[PDB]
């Protein structure tokens, strides 16, 4: 129990004003671990990508830990999953980078995909126009927000053939 999940900090009640622009660096460290955990090996697909599956260490480090037809869907119980995963079921790296794009949307936005319309269905219309978040008063001036949002829109493609690899998305973020 190092710090709980990101949902223990990002989606916690009260207000919880967490940090300035260091959670982007936490995401860089997470994807930097993920790249050799799931590509540089023989083959590994993470299969369980979730905000509650991303943790926080003592220096706010996101080390990922602890990860045939089934009629009950368990993999991706919410909007983390993919429109191609709804069709075929073949676990690829496109599903992993798609869930990486939606957790980028969580860490820049601070919203989840629940109904009181969902995450992509609101943010991908809402496109300059970086007036989406108001949890922080100094939410804008990191200045890489619009290019980071363009990176997220490039990760959130409906097609799997213009797929951004997990390696090449890292060095575009720094």
């Amino acid at each position: 129990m190092p710090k709980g999940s990101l949902e223990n900090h990002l989606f916690r009640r009260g207000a919880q004003p967490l940090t300035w622009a260091i959670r982007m660096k936490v995401a860089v460290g997470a994807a930097k671990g993920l790249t050799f955990l799931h590509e540089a090996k023989s083959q590994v697909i993470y299969r369980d990508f979730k905000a509650a599956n991303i943790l926080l260490d003592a220096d706010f480090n996101a080390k990922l830990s602890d990860f045939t037809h089934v009629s009950t869907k368990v993999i991706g119980t919410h909007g983390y999953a993919a429109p191609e995963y709804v069709a075929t079921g073949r676990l690829t790296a496109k599903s992993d980078v798609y869930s990486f794009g939606v957790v980028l949307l969580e860490l820049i936005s601070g919203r989840r995909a629940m109904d009181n319309y969902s995450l992509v269905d609101w943010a991908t219309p809402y496109l300059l126009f970086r007036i989406m978040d108001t949890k922080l008063g100094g939410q804008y001036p990191q200045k890489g927000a619009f290019t980071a949002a363009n990176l997220a829109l490039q990760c959130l493609n409906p097609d799997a053939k213009l797929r951004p690899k997990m390696s090449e998305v890292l060095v575009t973020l720094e």
Partner: protein, 327 residues
């Protein structure tokens, strides 16, 4: 033997859920014997097998001068799950209440001396429909496909509307729609339903469930069931019928063929002379190609991601009846 206590316990819970659904006002179930049903099935494994699924295996059989369609249940796959046994008795009692339609598979009774109540139905002549069409050694024409479409549609409307309290079963596949001698589409296994309570039309199904590919991904990502959770997956129960291409489609490489994606891109790429199950294309295609175009635009309209654009089951069944007008 312990067949008697099998019979007593499962008849007890069967009567309890029977009266809890519909006031003890059943349809004339009759009882069969173990010897009768075992001489029908010839000890459960032969060419008399027809269809597989998760819980149940649809067999043929023959009691004295009368063949029948039989359904048992998996003893190993059910008995360790309270939600599964609460599910399967909902299945048998809702089907038993559902015998009052001529488009559902009529129930004829059940034997109770087993671990689980294997149950008889009306004998449809042809076997279970596969993911394309007929399964016996043969292809089937076009007008019978339209009849299968309209009868699946109004049966699902019955499931949607025919009561004070409405029920939803979360999967309509061509693996379920059985088919008789006179070529009607008798749907069966009302067996993944939930009865959502009075008035409210939206409830949090705590298990997203049922036959991957036909999931309606808004429901898959929002984990509550609506009216529309069937009106999606009926559309790719219609598309499967009219293109003959199974849902988990492959071309020599890792099954990456989303059916909706292929027909949606071919709608503006191939321009609709490519979606008509091509071995059927010895059809005369006189004016029924236009009704093919009408039902495919209905199917792609009833499956888009913004649910309020989707019509209800009543609308799709009404205009599916209306496109008979080629006559």
């Amino acid at each position: 033997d312990k067949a008697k206590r099998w019979f007593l316990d499962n008849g007890s819970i069967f009567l309890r859920e029977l009266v809890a659904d519909c006031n003890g006002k059943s349809i004339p179930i009759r009882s069969f014997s173990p010897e009768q049903i075992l001489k029908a099935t010839n000890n459960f494994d032969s060419s008399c097998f027809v269809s597989q699924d998760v819980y149940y295996k649809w067999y043929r059989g023959e009691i004295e001068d009368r063949s029948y369609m039989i359904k048992r249940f998996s003893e190993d796959e059910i008995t360790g799950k309270r939600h599964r046994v609460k599910e399967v008795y909902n299945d048998i009692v809702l089907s038993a209440r559902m015998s009052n339609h001529s488009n559902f598979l009529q129930l004829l009774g059940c034997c109770l001396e087993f671990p689980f109540p294997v149950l008889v139905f009306e004998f449809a002549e042809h076997g279970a429909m596969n993911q394309r069409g007929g399964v016996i050694v043969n292809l089937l024409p076009w007008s019978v496909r339209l009849k299968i479409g309209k009868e699946i549609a109004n049966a699902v409307t019955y499931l949607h509307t025919a009561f004070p309290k409405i029920i939803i079963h979360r999967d309509v596949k061509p693996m379920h729609v059985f088919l008789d001698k006179n070529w009607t589409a008798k749907l069966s296994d009302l067996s993944f339903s939930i009865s959502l309570p009075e008035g409210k039309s939206r409830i949090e199904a705590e298990w997203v469930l049922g036959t991957f590919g036909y999931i309606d991904p808004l429901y898959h990502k929002t984990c509550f069931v609506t009216e529309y959770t069937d009106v999606y997956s009926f559309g790719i129960c219609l598309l499967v019928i009219i293109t003959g291409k199974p849902a988990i489609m492959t071309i020599s490489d890792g099954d990456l063929q989303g059916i909706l994606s292929l027909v949606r891109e071919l709608c503006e790429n191939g321009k609709l002379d490519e979606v008509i199950d091509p071995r059927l294309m010895k059809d005369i295609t006189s004016g029924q190609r236009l009704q093919v175009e009408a039902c495919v635009v209905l199917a792609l309209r009833c499956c888009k991601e913004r649910d309020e654009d989707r019509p209800k089951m009543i609308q799709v069944a009404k205009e599916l009846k209306q496109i008979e007008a080629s006559l």
